[PDB]
Design a protein around this ligand. Structure first.
Ligand SMILES: [Mg+2]
Ligand SMILES: [Zn+2]
Ligand SMILES: [Zn+2]
Ligand SMILES: [Zn+2]
Lengths: 76, 57, 56, 109, 174, 113, 384, 97
DNA sequence: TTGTGCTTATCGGTAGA
RNA sequence: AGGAGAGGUAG
DNA sequence: TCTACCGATAAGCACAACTACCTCTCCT
């Protein structure tokens, strides 16, 4: 709660990088990709299909944190 | 005035020897809160990337 | 020991000069020559202060 | 241009000589611009990974520096953690110890 | 002292197999088996065989190198501590002139020195040396009880070597 | 707490589980299984319910520490002169009469047929 | 063996004492000719390390050694803290007495530290106020009383100085004598680090780090301790952190602030309107030699890869632009679109653009999502 | 001459404004002790989606660009250069005497 | 050489006991 | 292999 | 009527006087 409920560019880039690193290490893809040979393309496809099993923990400056998920947040 | 000790950043600004000597005499504790302090010790600054964390579940 | 050419050193041997001083120390001089055709990155200047590099 | 080459005798950094496969200095202004852009992985790689990379061993019980690792201030302990810090940090610690300043490190893991 | 004490771990799982959320628990236990199998040793705790009871799991922490993710899991298991003043049994493997071997399981090696048993003369008239001077025959395969002493350890193997003493009563096989 | 009886019962579980889906995609270690078969064959009890309850009864009726129970149960002395000579903690004590200890020795003698 | 990994935080600062100095040093011999020992560092003329294994100055760290002193030496960093405390507390009363009442004829004393003014030694030299001396002069007193210096115990370390009867150099042994009897609460209030008062040892630099002559001369110490203290003070000033080219702030800038990285190329740039704005021309001769890290281990640069272009100096954040690599038949030169010169604030007259090739996959992923040309279309300065 | 002034001013301004960043709550906080610099960003619109952007770094870079892209010519004997005026304005604590 | 900060050192100073 | 003195290029 | 710290002035004593690069020539 008390959040913008919008995925920032930095968080999106970090998620894409982590997913690309995971896929580049021969990891199964949750989404079905046809004619895709680049891990970045598969990561972007998964992000567009919001099927990534990732959770975002936003650290508030006061010391507390709020748990979110990539499916709950929206991408502009 | 803010009661925030940053010996490493002050030393990197100017006069590192005097700043380090004063910090050693006072026995202050550096929490590495600054971005440059984190970068010098191989840590992310945390402004754009690194402020949040990723958890599988 | 021997002296080897570096990464960006090349050319064709032109002359070898051997000489020594009165103290007895021997000196060896080897000269390498090469043709420098105008490349794309070369810079040319005019007689009135015009400065520029080769574009195409 | 440079891919791999000799390092400076003092600090484990690429030499400035061009003929010896020298590297490009990553100045303060470039670091500030990259901070403004918000890219940390590139900044972390350019300052730690591709730059001088080393390891330092810190005793978990006593907040001292131990040279496997072994601390002479305390007894032989099986709880010693390893941190990844640039070689410049180790050089600074050595200089501070030479001038008469002892640093205490409290690792979080 | 076979007290089943808890022991947390930070076993990491590679990104080679990260799928099947309905069967994700199968991948967790397999990684846990490979965690203590790689070590298979201890300094002052003992040994562990199987993860019978799993208490709880933790949040998956992702570390950015070679695609590795960590999992903090706390569970209880079988442990054995060789406390001082314990009478345990063991089987003999071979008989030599010095350092009589005693095998109380393949988990450790036990050596019997000269100043542990009663004084006797080594019988060289047969193949294996006997200790029947005090009306007791000891051979390979017979279980003999003895008291344990302070155990030692190594640096790489970290074997829990100890000394066998028969100074107590009820010596020999039973 | 597993001394002789309940330790053997759970070892049969992993052996009954080994026959099911014996293949493993990872690398197994063979010295862990050898430590279970070559160490549990020293002393074996018959039944779990009446054996684990009887050994804990003196913990409630008499005063004995946790470390003292393990050494006595594993040693399984057959007389009263051995318990006073093995452990040095029982020297010069009058908290428990030897006759109840002898009755417990007979009680431990009937569990093992 | 194997050790766990962890993060670093909460760096503490303190002045080194004898305990930590002795504990940190390993194989600390006291031989004058063993400064370049075979147990400290690799660059010693044996190529063998006693503490560590054989290496190529890449797996062995610089070991430390600490010499020992026959007599105790006060810490130079606490010299002012002791000098200020001695001025307040009376030297013969140990209170906050002949040295207190003005009617006894004893003038007040001032404790101060000289800096290479009298004997080139940074020590405690007590001075009497000359204003009080003139007051005694006008009353008929010409010389100081013979029992004026009775509070200083006899010290064998004293030597022939003969400077003046009004000024005396305080022996390091006399410093401890004067500090006795003072309450520990007052001493701890002025000096936070009481355990570092005694300096009975001094460390030497590792052979792998680099002053050596001064350290060798300090092995044999005897007689007066003021000379030893001066030698220690002179040796401490040879550290790279003290200002005097690679020293002080320049050392920080060239070590921790500014660093050099691998996988970098620097060539002269020319104009090529045919190339796209977000594409950078890379010569085929250099692309085949530059190696990148791609997980299947190195492959040559090709089309589609992204590089970080920068023009020195970086006056604004828009100088860092990520462009896609486009292979061109031209060699020893890089082609850039003339329109993209405005963000770089450069022209085609000799300007050199040095790029950075990202090796990690995450670095490449974040490079074209935040530092790409299409992401920087809006100027962050004026909004245009 | 006067070439070192923009560089020194830019470095000294960066050392001050580097720690400034925007928080998730919408406030502007410093990295040292989470000191509150501004309760709400004073921008005149139009998008408030910036959360992790380093506002202080951007402002310092803009001021550095203004300083570098400025002349060093003394306009008159009395008047100062357009960069000297910026230097004097940015330094307020130095002119206390 | 300057350009400012920064720490000793001296001239008088008025107020209160 | 390492340091000091000159000259030079780009904004 | 004799002492306390307290205002302004002399005098040393410090740091600082831009980035990013390239050559040559001299020691040590
Ligand atoms: Mg130009
Ligand atoms: Zn320790
Ligand atoms: Zn070594
Ligand atoms: Zn007094």
């Amino acid at each position: 709660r008390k959040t913008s409920k919008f995925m920032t560019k930095y968080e999106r880039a970090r998620i894409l990088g982590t997913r690309a690193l995971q896929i580049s290490m021969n990891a199964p893809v949750m989404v079905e990709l046809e004619g895709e040979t680049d891990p970045l393309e598969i990561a972007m496809k998964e992000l567009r299909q919001r099927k990534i099993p990732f959770t975002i923990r936003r650290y508030l400056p006061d010391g507390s944190f709020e748990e979110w998920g990539v499916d709950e947040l929206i991408v502009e | 005035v803010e009661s925030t000790p940053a010996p490493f950043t002050q030393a990197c600004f100017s006069s590192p020897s005097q700043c380090f000597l004063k910090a050693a005499k006072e026995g202050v504790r550096d929490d590495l809160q600054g971005s440059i302090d984190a970068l010098a010790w191989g840590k992310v600054p945390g402004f754009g990337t690194g402020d949040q964390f990723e958890i599988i579940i | 020991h021997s002296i080897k050419l570096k990464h960006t050193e090349r050319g064709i041997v032109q002359k070898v000069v051997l000489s020594s001083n009165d103290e007895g120390k021997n000196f060896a001089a080897v000269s390498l020559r090469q043709v420098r055709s105008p490349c794309l990155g070369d810079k040319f200047s005019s007689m009135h202060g015009q400065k520029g590099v080769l574009g195409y | 241009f440079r891919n791999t080459g000799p390092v400076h005798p003092l600090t484990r950094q690429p030499v400035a000589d061009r003929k010896r496969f020298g590297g490009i200095k990553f100045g303060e202004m470039e670091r500030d611009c990259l901070i403004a852009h918000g890219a940390s992985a590139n900044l972390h790689e350019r300052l730690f990974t591709l730059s001088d990379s080393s390891q330092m061993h810190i005793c978990r019980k006593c907040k001292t520096y131990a040279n496997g690792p072994y601390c002479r201030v305390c007894v032989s302990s099986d709880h010693v953690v390893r941190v990844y810090v640039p070689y410049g940090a180790k050089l600074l610690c050595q200089e501070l110890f030479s001038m008469g300043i002892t640093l205490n490190f409290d690792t979080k893991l | 002292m076979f007290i089943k004490v808890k022991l947390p771990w930070d076993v990491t799982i590679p990104a080679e197999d990260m799928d099947t959320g309905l069967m994700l628990q199968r991948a967790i236990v397999i990684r846990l088996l490979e965690a203590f199998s790689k070590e298979k040793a201890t300094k002052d705790l003992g040994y562990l065989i199987t993860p019978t009871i799993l208490e709880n799991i933790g949040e998956g922490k992702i570390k950015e190198q070679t695609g590795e993710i960590q999992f903090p899991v706390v569970f209880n298991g079988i442990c054995f501590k060789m406390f001082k003043g314990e009478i345990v049994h063991g089987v003999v493997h071979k008989v030599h002139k010095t350092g009589v071997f005693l095998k109380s399981g393949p988990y450790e090696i036990i050596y019997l020195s000269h100043m542990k048993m009663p004084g006797y003369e080594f019988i060289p008239g047969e193949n294996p040396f006997f200790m029947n001077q005090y009306m007791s025959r000891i051979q390979i395969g017979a279980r003999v009880r003895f008291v344990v002493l302070d155990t030692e350890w190594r640096e790489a193997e970290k074997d829990f070597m100890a000394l066998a003493s028969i100074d107590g009563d009820n010596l020999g096989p039973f | 707490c597993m001394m002789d009886c309940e330790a053997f019962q759970i070892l049969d579980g992993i052996k009954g589980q080994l026959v099911g889906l014996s293949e493993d995609p990872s690398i197994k270690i063979p010295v862990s299984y050898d430590r279970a078969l070559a160490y549990v064959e020293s002393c074996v009890h018959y039944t779990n319910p009446q054996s684990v309850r009887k050994v804990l009864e003196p913990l409630k009726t008499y005063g004995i520490s946790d470390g003292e129970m393990c050494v006595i149960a594993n040693a399984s002395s057959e007389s009263v002169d051995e318990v006073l000579a093995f452990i040095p903690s029982l020297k010069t004590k009058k908290e428990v009469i030897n006759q109840p200890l002898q009755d417990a020795l007979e009680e431990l003698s009937k569990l093992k047929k | 063996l194997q050790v766990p990994v962890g993060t670093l935080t909460s760096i503490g600062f303190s002045i080194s004492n004898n305990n930590d100095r002795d504990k940190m040093s390993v194989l600390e011999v006291e031989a004058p000719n063993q400064v370049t020992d075979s147990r400290l560092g690799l660059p010693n003329p044996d190529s063998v390390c006693r503490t560590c294994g054989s290496k190529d100055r890449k797996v062995c760290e610089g070991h430390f050694g600490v010499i020992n002193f026959a007599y105790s030496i006060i810490n130079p960093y606490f010299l002012k803290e002791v000098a200020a405390l001695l001025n307040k507390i009376c030297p013969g009363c140990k209170y906050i007495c002949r040295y207190c009442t003005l009617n006894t004829g004893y003038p007040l004393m001032k404790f101060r530290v000289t800096t290479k003014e009298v004997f080139r030694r940074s020590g405690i030299v007590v001075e009497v106020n000359e204003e009080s001396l003139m007051k005694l002069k006008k009353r008929g007193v010409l010389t100081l009383p013979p029992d004026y210096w009775s509070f200083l115990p006899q010290d064998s370390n004293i030597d022939e100085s003969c400077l003046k009867p009004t000024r005396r150099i305080i022996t390091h042994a006399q410093v401890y004598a004067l500090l006795l009897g003072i309450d520990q609460r007052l001493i701890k209030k002025d000096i936070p680090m009481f355990n570092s008062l005694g300096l009975t040892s001094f460390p030497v630099t590792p052979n792998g780090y680099r002053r050596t002559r001064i350290y060798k001369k300090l092995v044999g110490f005897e007689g007066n301790t003021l000379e030893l203290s001066s030698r220690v003070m002179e040796c401490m000033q040879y550290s790279r952190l003290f200002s005097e080219k690679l020293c002080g702030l320049r050392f920080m800038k060239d070590v921790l602030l500014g660093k050099r990285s691998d996988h970098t190329f620097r060539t002269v740039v020319v104009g090529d309107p045919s190339l796209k704005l977000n594409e950078i021309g890379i010569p085929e001769s250099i692309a085949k030699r530059l190696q990148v890290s791609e997980h299947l281990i190195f492959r040559s640069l090709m089309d589609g890869d992204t590089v970080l272009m920068n023009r020195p100096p970086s006056i604004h954040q828009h100088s860092l632009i990520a462009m896609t690599v486009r292979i061109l038949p031209t060699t020893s030169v890089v082609s850039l679109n003339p329109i993209c010169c405005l963000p770089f604030r450069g022209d085609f007259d000799g300007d050199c653009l040095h790029g950075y090739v990202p090796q990690s996959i995450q670095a490449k992923v974040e490079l074209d999502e935040l530092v790409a040309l299409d992401k920087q279309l809006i100027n962050r300065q004026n909004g245009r | 001459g006067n070439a070192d002034l923009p560089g020194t001013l830019s470095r000294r301004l960066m050392f001050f404004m580097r720690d400034i960043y925007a928080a998730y709550d919408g406030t502007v906080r410093n990295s040292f002790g989470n000191q509150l610099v501004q309760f709400t960003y004073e921008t005149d619109g139009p998008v408030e989606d910036i959360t992790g952007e380093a506002l202080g770094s951007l402002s310092a870079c803009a001021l550095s660009e203004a300083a570098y892209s400025a002349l060093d010519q003394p306009i008159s004997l009395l008047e100062t250069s357009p960069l000297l005026n910026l230097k004097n304005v940015l330094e307020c604590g130095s002119k206390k005497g």
